[PDB]
Amino acid sequence: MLEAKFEEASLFKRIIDGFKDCVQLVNFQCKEDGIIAQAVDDSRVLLVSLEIGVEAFQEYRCDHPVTLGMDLTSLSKILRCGNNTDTLTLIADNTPDSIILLFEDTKKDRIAEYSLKLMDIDADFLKIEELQYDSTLSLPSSEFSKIVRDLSQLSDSINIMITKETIKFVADGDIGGGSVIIKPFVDMEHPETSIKLEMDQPVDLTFGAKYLLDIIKGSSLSDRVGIRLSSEAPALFQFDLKSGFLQFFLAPKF
Amino acid sequence: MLEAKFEEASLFKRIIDGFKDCVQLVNFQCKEDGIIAQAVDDSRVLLVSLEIGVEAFQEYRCDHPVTLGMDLTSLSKILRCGNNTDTLTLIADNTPDSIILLFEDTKKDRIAEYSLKLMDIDADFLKIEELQYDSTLSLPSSEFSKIVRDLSQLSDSINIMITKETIKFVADGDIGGGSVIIKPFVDMEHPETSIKLEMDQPVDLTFGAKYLLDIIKGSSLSDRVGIRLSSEAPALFQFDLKSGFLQFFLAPKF
Amino acid sequence: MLEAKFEEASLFKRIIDGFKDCVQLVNFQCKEDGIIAQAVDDSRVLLVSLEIGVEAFQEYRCDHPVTLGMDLTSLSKILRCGNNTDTLTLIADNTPDSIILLFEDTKKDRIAEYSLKLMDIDADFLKIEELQYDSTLSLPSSEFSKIVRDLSQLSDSINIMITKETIKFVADGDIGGGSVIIKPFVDMEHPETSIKLEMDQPVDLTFGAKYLLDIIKGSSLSDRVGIRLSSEAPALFQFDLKSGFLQFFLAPKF
């Protein structure tokens, strides 16, 4: 029997928003020490990896490994049904035909129980993360969100260029162009505005805006975003959770 | 001469919102002791009955019965023109070709006078309400609104099932399912959250969500909704006014 | 070299909103004492004239006259990229191939530099304004905005009728009609609510709502709108700036 109790349904809903507009069906491998889930879009240039530790729940019990694949188009609908700041409990019994989502609230007033029909999905799990990445920066997700949103106005292709102590986002379109530059700094008034950068080797990569716009969906999950870049491999965009994370692996072109 | 003065135009606009997305043209039978109006959608499974007593206005005068049929698509447009919290006065003279809607405000600053061309419409008024209904409950319109909106995500058909001291709204779709259960209780901290239920005989009816979504439009008119159910006849959904009401008669299928 | 520094980008963005949904490409004739710009829609019934004095900027330098034509569809996109309450600096060098838009903020945190490819556009500048107009009124832009928006619901044609101390906006549609009447008055509690009217000769003109709706876009630029009317020539709708203005010349039909 599985019983994973989110303190606030928002968390799970906001997590699903990460996968939503970029992948369809996802296997949520549940087990002893939490949940993990992976998915890849049709064109195989964006991979989303989720890990949720036990501490991210208020209560978590999984007697025995249970893999629950489900349609996120359909799951999300049920997430709409819930009350944003209400306790959500996932329930399942061995070899589920279905998973039960369970909303509660303050008073035993309205307690909604939904059920989602599950689906068999062949896995073939990937493990592409690398040991070392040529460059590794971290900035407020809100700032990174802005930069992408703005430069997306001009070009369908955003170039990220990193020399030492210099991160340059560039967009060049038929219709004009644009470029933001930021620098590392420790902000003691509020360290959550800080910009970090550990450049081992410089990088000059170009990603599709279509996907960078999907990646910034996770901005609702963490104050900061973790962007690891190397020129031979996909970039790691990571939003950290209380215990766990949401990772986006994006391959740049050319 | 007719002169019906709403204190706030919102009331009349919110009333029209009740008829709007479910019926088209409506005869507003005006007379001595107020206004009444009835309408039925194309498929004849939803009937809307309105009664507005004199006390619901701040000033009301109707010398002589005047039946004013009008296009609610067109009327609503004029209701858009008005200032939400402004006094609205309906004016008409014997055998109107048209009705005049009259907005005012605080200062004699802007005073807008609109006119709506009326239409001849054959009536055939219905009187289908019954003496006794097998079950009769009442709950906060906001709560009932939620229940319908949520379960509408999953199924195009919502089943309401009432045994003693047990009201169970159920939705079962191709894509999972859902079900809310509520109980009667007197809430003294705020009696407007109370749930009442007088079950003479149990009921197990299923209505189309399409229409239950239209019915919850009246949630802007009253804190509570009055749902009377019987298994042989259409359900009565009623939102009470200061003096009057807005009723929705809905036939369940099968 | 040109360097025009708006204190807040909003101003320039809100100015562009004036031209936006009514004209396409516009030549911004920049020179010593500021910027001016003119444009005419396809059907040539709406002409927009802008003047921005030096005092409207916080810093302005134009060594030498520079005419910069540009696509407002495309310019606006870049105006989306900026931070509403941030300093915006237009930069250009002799015979630009392009103009540079430059956002800043509080801290030297994010400083975005965009560039817009310019376009050659043949001018043929118009000077149609007249010495005297038969009638000249001024009212709160918010009020005038409302009047147009409301009466636009009913008719695609709005008639403005001015006799002495009487301004009557009228709309008459297939579906009913409407008419607002206002009077001149000095409001000492707040003179910005005042309504002025200097009628030399009466006027009875009818304009297309399509365009009056475009004209009220400038309501974001000034508290009041200046409407000058004469029966032989286009109406002057003018929203005043700190130093300058945004004018809309509209020809009435029949």
Numbering used by the authors:
A (entry chain A), B (entry chain A), C (entry chain A): 1 to 254
Excerpt from the paper describing this PDB structure:
We first measured the growth rate of these 17 strains in liquid media. The remaining five strains had growth rates similar to the wild type strain of approximately 2 to 3 hours. These data agree reasonably well with the qualitative spotting assay described above in which the A112G, S177G and G178M strains showed minor defects in cell growth and the S115E and G178L strain showed a major defect in cell growth. All 17 strains had increased sensitivities to UV radiation to some extent compared to the wild type except G178M. We then examined the rates of spontaneous mutagenesis and the rates of UV-induced mutagenesis of these 17 strains as well as E113G and G178S. By contrast, all 17 strains, except the S177G, S179A, and V180A mutant strains, had statistically significant defects in the rate of UV-induced mutagenesis (with p values less than 0.05). A defect in UV-induced mutagenesis is a characteristic indicator of a defect in error-prone TLS.
Proliferating cell nuclear antigen (PCNA) is a protein that is essential for many DNA metabolic processes including DNA replication, base excision repair, nucleotide excision repair, mismatch repair, and recombination. PCNA is a ring-shaped homo-trimer that acts as a sliding clamp that encircles DNA forming a scaffold for binding numerous proteins involved in DNA metabolism. PCNA is required for translesion synthesis (TLS), which is a pathway for bypassing DNA damage during replication.
